[PDB]
């Protein structure tokens, strides 16, 4: 029973227009299924592409886990993120598949494990992976503009947030009804921020404000 | 009424 | 037009009886086909099991090459040698598959190459791999006994040879009609020596004597 | 007649 029209009227504010964001105005469809397999940049070792499994579906996002890792470092990725790609992309490129940082077996076991986890897997088909949206050429956010953003400290959660500062190619994100412990800076073209209405559109859940 | 909200 | 009966009568010698050898009295059938894949101890790194391909069939022996190596170090193995095993044996045992010593790509490529070479391969079925014969409990060779042996310096070749010395668990092999450059010591239970009649039986070719 | 045999 939170609603954007009322909330903005109430707080005498406006929502960032969709054109500020590196997000599609029509959000992407998420046709992934739990259990599918893909290649993902290691969120803790960005020079590394690893095999990942879909653990959960939420909205336009995938909850992912790097195969052979513990269950403690699952990350979220939009289906149109360039950090995920279909199995075989490295091979196509001539790149290597790497073990994850969190890898739980003796390191020399890697080749066998790769063989074991890729056999009979359900691989995410290419068509499921969506066109990355274009970078707006300017930072058009203004202080006070309301938006929907991922709580970087708890990224299963998308929450109502406000632009607190705008500085060059960067914006300071604050979360309505939460302290500064949850604030953060990102680039204006970050993929962790969304225009109001995103959750409704994607079928994800928007968190209520803190208060 | 209220109590302050936690994060789910 | 060489024949054992005549040759032995001529040189006033006897052939080692089959019971001296670690070879089956009925030699094993070789039902491998060129192109099959198997696991083999690296003839140049004995702690290493590697993927190998059948390059040639001769008699009861396979000419093998470690996948990803050059064409310069092909080796021969009897179908009942414990140094070869069907693909998946390491995995079954919990062992690692290793790259060959002669490996021709950057080393970090190994895992991908393994994935690439094992997919859609023709794997040698288990049943093709034959029971290793038992070790005779004694060295029963006597000097002057004639036999059929692999020229270690040219192992595609099996040749008529004579026991020159017998010392403990070892025998000195000399090749009729060749100098000492081709002699060698092996254990009495070596798999590189055979009783006269082996080539005939297995359909391999026995080399004529040197002179 | 003969010549000494090579190895094939």
Swiss-Prot record, chains A, C:
Q: Where in the cell is it found?
A: Nucleus
**Name the UniProt record assigns to this protein:** Sex comb on midleg-like protein 2
Q: Which family does it belong to?
A: Belongs to the SCM family.
**What is the species of this protein?**
Homo sapiens (Human)
Q: In which tissues is it expressed?
A: Highly expressed in placenta, thymus and testis. Detected at lower levels in brain, liver, skeletal muscle, pancreas and ovary.
Question: Could you tell me what this protein does?
Answer: Putative Polycomb group (PcG) protein. PcG proteins act by forming multiprotein complexes, which are required to maintain the transcriptionally repressive state of homeotic genes throughout development.
Q: Transmembrane ranges?
A: none
**Which gene is this protein's source?**
SCML2
Task: Tell me where on the tree of life, at the top rank, the source sits.
Answer: Eukaryota
Q: Where are the MBT repeats?
A: 2-100, 108-209
Swiss-Prot record, chains B, D:
Question: Where in or outside the cell?
Answer: Nucleus; Chromosome
Tell me where on the tree of life, at the top rank, the source sits. Eukaryota
Signal peptide positions on this chain: none
Query: What modifications does the entry list under PTM / processing?
Result: Following DNA double-strand breaks (DSBs), it is ubiquitinated through 'Lys-63' linkage of ubiquitin moieties.
Q: Which family does it belong to?
A: Belongs to the histone H2A family.
What this chain does, per the entry, is described as: Core component of nucleosome. Nucleosomes wrap and compact DNA into chromatin, limiting DNA accessibility to the cellular machineries which require DNA as a template. Histones thereby play a central role in transcription regulation, DNA repair, DNA replication and chromosomal stability. DNA accessibility is regulated via a complex set of post-translational modifications of histones, also called histone code, and nucleosome remodeling.
Quaternary assembly? The nucleosome is a histone octamer containing two molecules each of H2A, H2B, H3 and H4 assembled in one H3-H4 heterotetramer and two H2A-H2B heterodimers. The octamer wraps approximately 147 bp of DNA.
Q: What is this protein called?
A: Histone H2A.J
> What species was this sequence derived from?
Homo sapiens
Q: Which residues of the full protein are shown?
A: 31 to 38 of 129
């Amino acid at each position: 029973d939170f609603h954007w029209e009322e909330y903005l009227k109430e707080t005498g504010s406006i929502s960032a227009p969709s054109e500020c964001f590196r997000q599609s105005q029509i959000p992407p469809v998420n046709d992934f299924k739990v259990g599918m397999k893909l290649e993902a940049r290691d969120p803790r070792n960005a020079t590394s592409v690893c095999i990942a499994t879909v653990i959960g579906i939420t909205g336009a996002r995938l909850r992912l886990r790097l195969d052979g890792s513990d269950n403690r470092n699952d990350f979220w990725r939009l289906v149109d993120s360039p950090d995920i790609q279909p199995v075989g992309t490295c091979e196509k490129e001539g790149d290597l598949l790497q073990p994850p940082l969190g890898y739980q077996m003796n390191t020399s076991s890697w080749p066998m494990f790769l063989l074991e986890t890729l056999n009979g897997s359900e691989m995410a088909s290419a068509t499921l992976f969506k066109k990355e949206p274009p970078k707006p050429p300017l930072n058009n956010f203004k202080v006070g503009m309301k938006l929907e953003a991922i709580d970087k400290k708890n990224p299963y959660l998308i929450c109502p947030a406000t632009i607190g500062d705008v500085k060059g190619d960067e914006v300071h994100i604050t979360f309505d009804g939460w302290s500064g412990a949850f604030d953060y800076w990102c680039k204006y073209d970050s993929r962790d921020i969304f225009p109001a209405g995103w959750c409704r559109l994607t079928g994800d859940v928007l968190q209520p404000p803190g208060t | 009424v209220h109590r302050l909200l936690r994060k789910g």
